[PDB]
Write an enzyme that holds these catalytic residues in place. Structure first.
Site, mmCIF file in Angstrom:
data_model
loop_
_atom_site.group_PDB
_atom_site.id
_atom_site.type_symbol
_atom_site.label_atom_id
_atom_site.label_comp_id
_atom_site.label_asym_id
_atom_site.label_seq_id
_atom_site.Cartn_x
_atom_site.Cartn_y
_atom_site.Cartn_z
ATOM 1 N N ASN A 139 1.772 4.332 -3.318
ATOM 2 C CA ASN A 139 1.871 5.788 -3.176
ATOM 3 C C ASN A 139 3.266 6.314 -3.537
ATOM 4 O OD1 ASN A 139 -0.773 6.973 -1.639
ATOM 5 N ND2 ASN A 139 -0.369 4.852 -1.033
ATOM 6 N N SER A 148 -3.373 5.863 5.075
ATOM 7 C CA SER A 148 -4.037 6.087 6.363
ATOM 8 C C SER A 148 -4.381 4.771 7.075
ATOM 9 C CB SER A 148 -5.293 6.944 6.179
ATOM 10 O OG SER A 148 -6.268 6.266 5.409
ATOM 11 N N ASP A 151 10.899 7.602 -1.808
ATOM 12 C CA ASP A 151 10.898 8.012 -3.217
ATOM 13 C C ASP A 151 11.683 9.316 -3.370
ATOM 14 O OD1 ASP A 151 8.937 10.478 -3.729
ATOM 15 O OD2 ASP A 151 7.872 9.163 -2.341
ATOM 16 N N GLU A 188 0.824 -1.210 0.000
ATOM 17 C CA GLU A 188 0.000 0.000 0.000
ATOM 18 C C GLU A 188 0.863 1.267 0.000
ATOM 19 O OE1 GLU A 188 -3.267 -0.744 -0.307
ATOM 20 O OE2 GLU A 188 -3.533 1.362 -0.849
ATOM 21 N N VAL A 240 -6.582 1.500 -1.102
ATOM 22 C CA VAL A 240 -7.144 1.587 0.257
ATOM 23 C C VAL A 240 -6.600 2.814 1.011
ATOM 24 C CG1 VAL A 240 -7.828 0.201 2.260
ATOM 25 C CG2 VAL A 240 -7.032 -0.949 0.206
ATOM 26 N N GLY A 241 -5.333 3.161 0.771
ATOM 27 C CA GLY A 241 -4.713 4.372 1.322
ATOM 28 C C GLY A 241 -3.692 4.103 2.417
ATOM 29 N N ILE A 279 -3.640 13.313 4.576
ATOM 30 C CA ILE A 279 -3.362 12.085 3.813
ATOM 31 C C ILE A 279 -3.080 10.900 4.755
ATOM 32 C CG2 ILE A 279 -1.792 10.971 2.141
ATOM 33 C CD1 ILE A 279 -1.401 13.927 1.004
ATOM 34 N N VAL A 321 -6.938 10.530 7.198
ATOM 35 C CA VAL A 321 -8.308 10.491 6.660
ATOM 36 C C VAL A 321 -8.420 9.396 5.598
ATOM 37 C CG1 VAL A 321 -10.143 11.799 5.493
ATOM 38 C CG2 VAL A 321 -8.582 12.965 7.081
HETATM 39 O O1 HFC Z 1 1.003 10.416 -1.018
HETATM 40 C C1 HFC Z 1 1.694 9.657 -0.383
HETATM 41 C C2 HFC Z 1 1.309 8.958 0.826
HETATM 42 C C3 HFC Z 1 2.148 8.113 1.442
HETATM 43 C C4 HFC Z 1 3.466 7.865 0.916
HETATM 44 C C5 HFC Z 1 4.384 6.981 1.488
HETATM 45 C C6 HFC Z 1 5.638 6.806 0.924
HETATM 46 O O2 HFC Z 1 6.534 5.944 1.474
HETATM 47 C C7 HFC Z 1 5.994 7.517 -0.231
HETATM 48 O O3 HFC Z 1 7.244 7.344 -0.737
HETATM 49 C C8 HFC Z 1 5.089 8.387 -0.822
HETATM 50 C C9 HFC Z 1 3.843 8.549 -0.245
HETATM 51 O O4 HFC Z 1 2.967 9.423 -0.872
#
Ligand code: HFC
Ligand code: HFC
Ligand code: AX7
EC number: 5.6.2.2
Lengths: 188, 185
Positions: free
Chosen positions: B31, B88, B58, B27, B85-86, B79, B82
């Site tokens: 993102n 969160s 990233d 998950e 699946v997300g 983010i 809330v």
């Molecule tokens: O929008 C988002 C939410 C969580 C998230 C977690 C990470 O590890 C990432 O590299 C980028 C992300 O971007």
């Protein structure tokens, strides 16, 4: 409940010096007294257990158990999980909380951890009695420094409360040392 | 987040056999790939740490840090808190989660515990780089029996993702036994 978890001090009070910790008991007591006043016999019992949990029982009608049409869970769960400050604050800041409701010839049981119900409210058995009981273990992640319940703080407050609530029997019991008190003012 | 906490299995997957545990990583990876694609270098680094946490980096733009006008807290916190699946959900089922956002010349940090922010998103320093990093510790109250991350389960899925996301470099690192891989199409 996340608003309470974000800033516990705003809802319960000081979480270090012990005033917030004892306010947890007194919030539950206020709700128990409200249920006791609805009846004629009226009795509440506050028990300090050997594992530093506190239970508060009343012999009132019992909190509503039927499913809430909007929320889709027992009315009891709505009371325990939706934001005096409300018992939901006590539930949110308790690492464990046990709810037992005796109503319509049935025993209802539910367990919470940090405000999260572990299962839906369940009818587990039968009973002739009525009432509501909440036993809670204060969260040691929130409550620091002073984490043990002082008997004298509870005893003093329950004595003051007895005189404002006529016909309500208030029993205090300490299972650590066996000490107990009975405050029952029948004025008016 | 209490809806997730009530029934974790319904959101993340089975919490006893190890399916849910590994889906936590996937998950977060989804993102991270989204952020990677819209940046320049487009690389993600998934690290399995010695203390049974997983971090996903990233080198994208960095997620928005400004205050959300409705919620009254940082857009990053919205983010993380809330209700793909997300993340969160991942935050709600993690006993700890560390968020690090590098954006607009500034490093931003925030710590969560079981989805609850311990303080507001805060500027902690300056930086030339950009990107987002989440390191999370799965809640051992939720995840039972299979608690440790199997390397081959993560490697298998990241390989599948590298073919599908052809521009994105995916590095996998295990600090427990020094094992490593680099998936890139
Ligand atoms: O929008 C988002 C939410 C969580 C998230 C977690 C990470 O590890 C990432 O590299 C980028 C992300 O971007
Ligand atoms: O919210 C409520 C309402 C009634 C009530 C009665 C009790 O005896 C108790 O311990 C807790 C309670 O919490
Ligand atoms: N230990 C612990 N702390 C918590 C706080 C919020 C929800 C669940 C939790 N479990």
């Amino acid at each position: 409940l996340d608003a309470v978890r974000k800033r516990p001090g705003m809802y319960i009070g000081d979480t270090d010096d012990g005033t917030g910790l004892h306010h947890m008991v007194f919030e539950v007591v206020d709700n128990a007294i409200d249920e006791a006043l609805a009846g004629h016999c009226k009795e509440i019992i506050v028990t300090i257990h050997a594992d530093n949990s506190v239970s508060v029982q009343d012999d009132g009608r019992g909190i509503p158990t039927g499913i809430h049409p909007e929320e889709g869970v027992s009315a009891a769960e709505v009371i325990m999980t939706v934001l005096g400050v409300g018992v939901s604050v006590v539930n949110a800041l308790s690492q464990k909380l046990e709810l037992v409701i005796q109503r319509e010839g049935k025993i209802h049981r539910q367990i919470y951890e940090h405000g999260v119900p572990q299962a839906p409210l369940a009818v587990t058995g039968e009973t002739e009695k009525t009432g509501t009981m909440v036993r809670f273990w204060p969260s040691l992640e929130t409550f620091t420094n002073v984490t043990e319940f002082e008997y004298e703080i509870l005893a003093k407050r329950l004595r003051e409360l007895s005189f404002l609530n006529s016909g309500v029997s208030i029993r205090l019991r300490d299972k650590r040392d066996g000490k107990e008190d009975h405050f029952h003012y029948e004025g008016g």
